[PDB]
């Protein structure tokens, strides 16, 4: 029952949670925490290339609303947690609380209270904690919330699309109007995996006009840092994306967020440089990208540490 602190990095399938500490040196420590005493639906999965005979399974009913529930409430927030059990194969199980003390909002209870997760069948008698999950579950069944609603719940299953029929047409049809999206993954600083709304397109988006240090089978200078810079700001965040262009299945675009433009930020931090092959498709003024990059180069920041000024 040791309360430890942390910061929500992302929400996983079955409502599992990855928690991190803050940068004290290099990469911040990560912790996958499964929620004890409850069972949430499984998200859609795409078969790994490692297992070629396996195939893509879809969403379980109310699995995606369950993920979205926690994503809206937990992402970027400070939480406290206690580990209840740790299986010999390394998997940790525990309780997650919103706040700084263990009497804050219990995440597991919040899920069950809204019919987004059910109680695990216990053979023994309920502890104090398992009893309230029962109350939350009955209140949810009475109110007919989520999985306790009338019907399949099949409308909560996304028609996930991992490819696009014609990328050029799909991008041009939006006429550079911002698209509601969720940043699901961060490959490196300037390339992300986005879930496009409202038809649930899972696409690869590269930032227009710039390029961050990348990995190739291995990391380049400031690659892991730049990835974290983008991750710590946009991972599983609600954003708007301007579909500016495309090369094959990869979509060139710009990510919009109330806290700022990640493209300008990356440049100003020296985590990225301007590239001329794609700078023409940047619709938010390419001259500002030049200024952001020039700002960093003058101060020899990160990738410009070994920059030699002309003389």
């Amino acid at each position: 029952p040791t309360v430890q602190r942390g910061i929500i990095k992302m929400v996983l399938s079955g409502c599992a949670i990855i928690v991190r500490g803050q940068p004290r040196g290099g990469p911040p420590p990560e912790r996958q925490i499964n929620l004890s005493n409850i069972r949430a639906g499984n998200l859609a999965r795409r078969a790994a290339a490692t297992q070629p005979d396996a195939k893509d399974t879809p969403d379980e009913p109310w699995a995606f609303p369950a993920r979205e529930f926690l994503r809206k409430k937990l992402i970027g927030k400070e939480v406290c947690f206690t580990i209840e059990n740790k299986t010999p194969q390394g998997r940790e199980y525990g309780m997650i609380y919103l706040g700084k003390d263990t009497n804050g909002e219990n995440i597991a209870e919040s899920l069950v209270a809204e019919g987004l997760a059910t109680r695990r069948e216990g053979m023994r008698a309920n502890n104090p904690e398992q009893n309230r999950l029962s109350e939350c579950e009955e209140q949810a069944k009475a109110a007919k919330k989520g999985m306790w609603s009338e019907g399949n719940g099949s409308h909560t299953i996304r028609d996930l699309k991992y490819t696009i029929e014609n990328p050029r047409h799909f991008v041009d049809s939006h006429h550079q109007k911002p698209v509601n999206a969720i940043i699901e993954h961060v490959r490196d600083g300037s390339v992300v995996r986005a879930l496009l709304l409202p038809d649930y397109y899972l696409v690869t988006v590269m930032l227009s006009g710039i390029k961050c240090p990348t990995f190739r089978r291995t990391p380049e200078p400031f690659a892991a840092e730049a990835k974290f810079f983008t991750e710590s700001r946009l991972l599983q965040r609600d954003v708007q994306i301007i579909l500016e262009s495309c090369h094959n299945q990869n979509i060139l675009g710009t990510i919009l967020h109330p806290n700022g433009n990640i493209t300008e930020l990356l440049l100003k931090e020296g985590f990225a440089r301007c590239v001329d092959w794609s700078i023409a498709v940047y619709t938010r003024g390419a001259e500002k990208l030049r200024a952001a990059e020039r700002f960093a180069k003058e101060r020899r920041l990160r990738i410009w540490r070994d920059y030699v000024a002309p003389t």
């Binding site: 803050q22 940068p23 040196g25 290099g26 990469p27 911040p28 994503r71 809206k72 409430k73 992402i75 970027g76 927030k77 400031f222 840092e225 974290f228 810079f229 710590s232 700001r233 946009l234 965040r237 609600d238 967020h257 806290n259 931090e269 990160r302």
Partner: peptide, 13 residues
């Protein structure tokens, strides 16, 4: 200091 976590939180709310 090249591991820059944001001061202000970038939340969905």
């Amino acid at each position: 200091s090249d591991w820059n976590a944001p001061a202000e939180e970038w939340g969905n709310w």
